[PDB]
Structure formats: structure tokens, C-alpha cells
């Protein structure tokens, strides 16, 4: 505590992550949301790169301001410290990742089938913890929360097939 002292920075990452998720799910100004359309494409394996436009985030913040809601400056936070927001946006995309509408066939990449295999394996190990603890007979919320403490799953960075990039916000659109 005396060593490695704490500092008070104006950056709150919890509501910044909430804003990131809201922007990913609700932004549609560029038929539905642009970014879930892109994540749906990624799920079906037509795209392996996610480009996050800073113009889109700035426009989303401007629209939120126009309707009266006070939104944190996500664009400025990304510009000041961009390494953390690649990490953040990847987690947010993983949370809102649509299920693929195309099944895995023999013409898919080896990386895609490996990721599908480990995803199914970790969901099966979750289910196996759950069934074992149910058989032990010791609320489903607590049961689940025990399961994710006693599971060694594949982390999201190992079940991840896309790449994240930040397109700078245009000078005219600044």
C-alpha cells in the first residue's frame, strides 16, 4: 500500500465498457445496427477483421448528447490510451457475438474448426461441472457461479478469430 501507491484518474472503465457495448449494439446510422451486422458476418466467417470507426463513436456520442443523455467521451479515451480499448472492445464483441448461421464444413479454415472445437469443449466442460455438482446435491445462480470457479475453460482470446483495429476519426468529420 505504501509501496505501489494508488492514483485517482478520471477514467472509469466500467461505464466506458458499458458505453462501448451500447454503441456496438445500438449504433445503426451507417437495415439494422452496423456493428452487429459486422459481427454476424464474422460469426459466419466472411470477415476476420473488425475496424472500429472513431467517426462512428463520435457520431454516436453526438446523438446521445442531442437527446439529452450525458455520455462519456469514448473517442478521447481511446485516443489517449488505445491499447486498453482494443482489449475492452474485444471483450464487448465477445459478449455480443451472434451465433453463426452457417455450419462448419470441410472448406473452412483449420483455425475456424479449432476455435469451434474448443468453444464446444468449454461449453461441455461447463455442463459437466454442472451435472456433477447437481449429482452431489449440496439456486441455479449459485450453481453456475460455482461452475465458472471450478472450470478451466479456453479463455476468450483463444476462441477469437477476428482482429480489431481503430480507424481514426476524419479531419472533416472531427
Amino acid at each position: 500500500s505504501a509501496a505501489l501507491p494508488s492514483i485517482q484518474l478520471p477514467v472509469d472503465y466500467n461505464n466506458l465498457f458499458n458505453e462501448i457495448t451500447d454503441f456496438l449494439v445500438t449504433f445503426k446510422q451507417d437495415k439494422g445496427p452496423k456493428y452487429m451486422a459486422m459481427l454476424q458476418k464474422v460469426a459466419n466467417r466472411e470477415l476476420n477483421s473488425v475496424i472500429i470507426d472513431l467517426d462512428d463513436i463520435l457520431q454516436y456520442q453526438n446523438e446521445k448528447f442531442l437527446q439529452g443523455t450525458q455520455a462519456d467521451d469514448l473517442v478521447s479515451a481511446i485516443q489517449q490510451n488505445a491499447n486498453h480499448f482494443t482489449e475492452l472492445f474485444c471483450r464487448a464483441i465477445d459478449n455480443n457475438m451472434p451465433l453463426p448461421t452457417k455450419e462448419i464444413d470441410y472448406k473452412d479454415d483449420v483455425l475456424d474448426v479449432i476455435l469451434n472445437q474448443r468453444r464446444l469443449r468449454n461449453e461441455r466442460m461447463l455442463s459437466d461441472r454442472t451435472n456433477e455438482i447437481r449429482s452431489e446435491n449440496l439456486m441455479n445462480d449459485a450453481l453456475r457461479e460455482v461452475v465458472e470457479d471450478e472450470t478451466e475453460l479456453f479463455p476468450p482470446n483463444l476462441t477469437r478469430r477476428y482482429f480489431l483495429y481503430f480507424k481514426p476519426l476524419s479531419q472533416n468529420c472531427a
Partner: protein, 637 residues
């Protein structure tokens, strides 16, 4: 380097201090007191310490309260810094000739942290705990060098070095064994400047489980407590104590490769001497203005003496003049210290010789329970070694040395050895104990009033015989007793039925918060040595009876704020009564000596103290001589 959490806790405790204004009031009062006698003398300086009520902290911020109780090393330093900042903020008028660190002390309900040396285990380590026990050892109050100031004569410059140990902070530092500077950086020889270096008082006491709560037949448990710069000399060996402090672990416990286990002790934050019966701690009581007003209001009454006499032991029937004598002894006279060095005794001794079951021991137990400072002893249960001092190259105070400025209740006085009797002879008149043993020539103060109970030779006071044969005590010893009461169990029908109705009424008593068939609980009454005047339960059914706590308050007020002066109008009565008692032939129970003149004077002074009068008037001398004539003869005039 500054810590964000540290500042957050500092500002939270500053908010707490702002919410409860009593803490600015206390700090402001301390600062103005210090400044006022600093400017007065260019008495004593109050410490920079504030008592913090943990209940108020729990009301304000429960997590700050739980943080202090459970994680003191992370919550107490920020709170102390907040208090210091607040004190330096109010310090618009600095003392003549942040700064001046203010320490914190805690009080209130500790819950599971209120422990004893036996129940204080290793899972209480690094916690703020309140430990109740008995002080068995008090080390020497040794100075600790916290800053050494040196002088370099070649450069003519003053240097300094600050020293830090593991016990001065709640958090662990990096150890920095800075050596004592014997020379400057560049080779100049340094001279230590004592009087400019800073030394902090340090004491290490040992707190052991109290005998009244420790298991019988089992070896007691002890805990070390370290006191620094204002808690030193707050207690003495044998004192009941409540120490609030952080249960710290120190050293490495044998892990650091150079002990069986880690060295654990309590960093004392607060020391409360507790009042337990038959202990050496007096009973300070808080006297509000309402209490003083009531005391003066009752003192204005004429029969207040009687009101105080009957309210002593309502449960005991009769023994009314014995109760009057007991009240006078509780007040007592005023001792005289003449310029040449001689001493005149101002303490009243009482002896009660009587038949079995006339409540002599209940009247002793009541005095033990109600007196400000009372020690209970039994004949041959405590010897002269146990009554007076004892050499251990060091002295251990006995029964009558711990009871200095107090009362000694000796039961079974007749069953006392002559070796004890000679020491008692010295203690009663000269009020001193001269050891002169094993190279220790010391005169301890034993200014105590002795009340004692005794049985006759044959176990029944024979009215046919004379008192001198019924007592079987040395005449020189009986002279020291200011008032000797012989009580006889005479079988008379009126008082037989009256005492039996009283005994049954007392047995038919219920506390306000108890059921008809609920066993009354009983605690040990560990009072802190710092709401109606009259009593609802009256065994007699009649004047009014005051409550025992109010009677203790009245006795304390009269004892500490009234010093009566003898008057000629009282002296005439005293001299006439003494001359008559000396010359009149009446076959007195006790002999008449010059000590009788002084028991007249002492009783007159005590009764003057009862009325809150600063002068002994004629009525005080008359009532003193009246009680004395009763005690010597049995008259009712």
C-alpha cells in the same frame, strides 16, 4: 508517495469529524488550554489525543468503523492525519514558541474484539482489540531516541537524524538501520547535543487475565502492551485495566535465517484503569451540574445526616449510630501537616465487637462495595506482609498501602496475630509503614481509615462481665479505634418481629426488569475510573432514602470540595465534652486518652463535611460528642 486510498480515507474521516462537532470542541479546548498556560508561564500540558466513540463512527460510516476495527493499519493512520489536519486548521492562534501529530484513542462497543488475554488468539492479529485484565508488570519508563541532534564545531553546524522502529507505526516500513552519526559526511567530528535531541517515553506493561474471571486452578494468560509518550505511568501493578490497541505481530518468528513463533504484542492506543472492589483503583465519578445542585439542595436540609445515615444500609435493620459513624468515616476529618513536619490524623477508625449475626460483616461488605477506595481483608488471611509492605530488592504494596487514602475493612479482627498487630499499631495513628528490611529503608504512606469487625472471647458478649475482659484486645490497640461499638443480640419481642419483617421484606424484592421466578443475574461491576436522587425500594416503612450511587456522589463532593475549619464555638463544646469524659467515672467501654480529644475533633470535622460547611459550628461538635458518648457508654441524649 501519496496514495489515493489514503487520501480518500483521510477526507472521509474529515467528514466524520465535521459531522460530530464534539471533536472540534475537544481539540479546540485542548489547544486553548495548552496556549493559555504556555502564555501564563512563558500546570501541565494536555496531550494531543482525542477519544473517539466507535458507536458514532458506526452511525456515520459503518465500513470506516469496520475498517478501523478489522484493518486498523490502513484506517487509523488516515484518521490520525485527518485529525492532525483539522487541528492545524483550527490553530489560528498558535501556541507561544502536518505539524504536531495528533493521536487517536477509541471507546465504545467493540463486539467480538472486546477480549481477554486468554481469549486473545492469533486470529485477532492486526486487529483493534480491547483487552481487559490485571496489570502484573510495569517496566521502567525509558526514553527512546527518535531524533538525535549533533553539532559540528569545525563547520559550526547543527545536524540531525531521525530514528524509526517497528512499533512506532501500524504499517510495516522498509527497515532502515541508520547508524548513530559519530562524524559528519566529510570527516568532521560530531558532538551529541542532549536537550535538542528528541526522546519519547516508552513503557511495556504486562496484562494478565483478572483473577475474578480467570479459571480457577489454571495458569493465567498474559499479553504485552506498549505505551508511548502519553500512556506511560497511566497504570500501576495490580490495577484492573482495559487497554485498547492493535494486536500486532513483529519480527520474523524464526523464518528470517540468522524464534519458535512470531513475537506478538499490543500497541496500546487507550488505557482505562478500571474500578473493581478490593482493588487499588479509586472510583472517580462524573458530577453533572444537576448532581451538584441536588447535593447542595439536600445539604440545605437539617436532617440530611439522618437521611444519609438511614440510606447507607436500609437492608440492615437498626445499627443507626453505627451507620452514622460509617458515614462520618466515609467523609472523615482533615489531616494536619504542620510546618515542622508533624502529622495529625484525619481518618476515622471504627471497631465493631459483637455477637454472631448482628450484621458486622454485612456492614463491612457494604462499606467495601460503596466506598470510593476500599480493600477487604480477614484476620490471619492476610499477615503483616499481606497488610503492610513486603520486600521482593523491590517493594510490593500490601493491603494497607494499596488502600492509601481509602478504607480497610478487616473482618475477624480478633483472629489476628501480634506480629500483624504491631504493624497495625503503626498504621492506625502515624499513617505510615516503615520497612527497614534487607537494605530497603522506606516510609510508605498508609493514610487509610480502618473499619473492623470482631467477636468476643466466649463468642457471646456477657453483659454481666466488663468490656475489657470480653474484648481480649490490647488496650493500646483499642485506643487507636476512634469509635468502638459493642453490639449485643438481645432477644426482645418488638425488635424480634421488626427485624424478621425487615429480613422478609428484603427477601421479597424484585428488580425492575425481572420476572417473579427469574434468577437475578450478577456481573462483576468493572466500573470505569473516570437518574433519581431518592430510592424507590424502601425496606423500612419514615424519612426518605437516597440511592447508593447518589450517596457516593454526595460523599465524593463533600470529600473533595469541602475542607472545614474548626471554630471556637465548636472548640468550647469539644473541650468541655473531652474534660467530662476524661474525669467522669462511668465505666467506659473504651479508655479515654488525648486520642479521644482528636476523635472528637475528627468527628466534628466529618459532620461539618456532611453539611457541606466550611466551618465546624457548635452543632457539629455536639453531634460528634453525642455519637462518641453513645459509642463509649450507650447514652441516647
Amino acid at each position: 508517495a501519496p496514495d489515493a486510498v489514503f487520501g480518500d480515507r483521510v477526507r472521509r474521516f474529515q467528514e466524520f469529524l465535521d459531522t460530530f462537532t464534539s471533536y472540534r470542541d475537544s481539540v479546540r479546548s485542548i489547544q486553548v488550554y495548552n496556549s493559555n498556560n504556555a502564555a501564563n508561564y512563558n500546570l501541565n500540558i494536555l496531550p494531543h489525543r482525542i477519544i473517539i466513540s466507535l458507536d458514532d463512527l458506526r452511525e456515520f460510516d459503518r465500513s470506516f468503523w469496520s475498517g478501523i476495527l478489522v484493518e486498523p493499519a490502513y484506517f487509523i493512520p488516515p484518521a490520525e492525519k485527518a485529525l492532525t489536519d483539522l487541528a492545524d486548521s483550527m490553530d489560528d492562534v498558535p501556541h507561544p514558541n502536518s505539524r504536531h501529530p495528533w493521536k487517536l484513542s477509541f471507546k465504545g462497543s467493540f463486539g467480538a474484539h472486546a477480549l481477554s488475554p486468554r481469549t486473545l488468539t492469533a486470529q485477532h492479529l492486526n486487529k483493534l482489540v480491547s483487552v481487559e485484565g490485571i496489570v502484573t508488570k510495569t517496566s521502567l519508563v525509558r526514553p527512546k531516541l527518535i531524533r538525535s541532534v549533533h553539532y559540528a564545531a569545525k563547520t559550526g553546524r547543527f545536524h540531525y537524524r531521525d530514528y524509526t522502529d517497528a512499533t512506532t507505526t501500524l504499517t510495516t516500513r522498509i527497515p532502515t538501520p541508520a547508524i548513530y552519526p559519530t562524524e559528519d559526511t566529510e570527516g568532521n567530528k560530531l558532538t551529541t547535543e542532549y536537550g535538542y535531541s528528541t526522546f519519547i517515553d516508552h513503557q511495556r506493561i504486562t496484562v494478565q487475565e483478572m483473577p475474578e474471571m480467570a479459571p480457577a486452578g489454571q495458569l493465567p494468560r498474559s499479553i504485552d502492551v506498549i505505551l508511548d509518550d502519553d500512556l506511560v505511568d497511566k497504570t500501576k501493578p495490580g490495577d484492573r485495566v482495559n487497554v485498547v490497541g492493535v494486536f500486532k505481530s513483529l519480527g520474523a518468528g524464526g523464518m528470517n535465517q540468522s524464534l519458535i513463533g512470531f513475537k506478538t504484542l499490543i500497541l496500546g492506543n487507550t488505557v482505562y484503569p478500571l474500578h473493581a472492589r478490593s482493588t487499588g483503583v479509586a472510583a472517580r465519578q462524573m458530577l453533572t451540574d444537576f448532581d451538584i445542585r441536588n447535593i447542595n439542595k439536600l445539604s440545605k436540609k437539617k436532617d440530611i445526616f439522618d437521611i444519609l445515615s438511614q440510606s447507607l444500609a436500609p437492608s440492615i435493620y437498626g445499627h443507626d449510630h453505627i451507620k452514622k459513624a460509617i458515614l462520618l468515616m466515609l467523609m472523615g476529618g482533615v489531616e494536619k501537616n504542620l510546618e515542622n513536619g508533624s502529622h495529625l490524623r484525619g481518618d476515622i477508625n471504627i471497631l465493631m465487637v459483637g455477637d454472631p449475626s448482628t450484621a458486622k460483616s454485612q456492614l463491612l461488605r457494604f462499606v467495601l462495595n460503596t466506598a470510593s477506595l476500599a480493600i477487604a481483608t480477614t484476620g490471619r488471611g492476610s499477615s503483616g506482609v499481606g497488610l503492610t509492605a513486603a520486600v521482593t530488592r523491590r517493594l510490593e504494596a500490601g493491603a494497607m498501602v494499596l488502600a492509601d487514602r481509602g478504607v480497610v475493612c478487616i473482618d475477624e479482627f480478633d483472629k489476628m496475630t501480634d506480629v500483624d498487630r504491631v504493624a497495625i499499631h503503626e498504621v492506625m495513628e502515624q499513617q505510615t509503614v516503615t520497612i527497614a528490611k534487607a537494605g530497603i529503608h522506606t516510609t510508605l504512606n498508609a493514610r487509610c481509615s480502618v473499619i473492623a469487625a470482631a467477636n468476643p472471647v466466649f463468642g457471646q458478649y456477657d453483659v454481666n462481665r466488663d468490656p475489657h475482659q470480653n474484648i481480649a484486645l490490647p488496650d493500646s490497640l483499642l485506643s487507636r479505634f476512634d469509635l468502638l461499638f459493642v453490639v449485643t443480640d438481645d432477644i426482645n419481642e418488638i425488635r424480634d418481629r421488626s427485624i424478621s419483617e425487615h429480613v422478609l421484606r428484603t427477601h421479597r424484592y424484585l428488580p425492575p426488569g425481572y420476572l417473579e421466578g427469574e434468577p437475578v443475574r450478577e456481573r462483576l461491576n468493572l466500573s470505569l475510573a473516570v437518574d433519581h436522587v431518592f430510592e424507590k425500594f424502601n425496606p423500612l416503612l419514615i424519612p426518605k432514602l437516597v440511592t447508593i450511587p447518589f450517596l457516593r456522589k454526595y460523599v465524593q463532593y463533600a470529600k473533595e470540595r469541602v475542607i472545614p475549619q474548626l471554630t471556637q464555638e465548636a472548640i468550647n463544646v469539644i473541650v468541655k465534652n473531652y474534660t467530662d469524659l476524661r474525669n467522669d467515672d462511668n465505666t467506659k467501654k473504651s479508655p479515654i486518652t488525648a486520642r479521644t480529644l482528636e476523635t472528637l475533633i475528627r468527628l466534628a470535622t466529618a459532620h461539618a463535611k456532611v453539611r457541606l460547611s466550611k466551618t465546624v459550628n457548635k452543632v457539629d461538635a455536639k453531634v460528634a460528642a453525642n455519637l462518641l458518648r453513645f459509642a463509649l457508654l450507650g447514652e441516647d441524649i
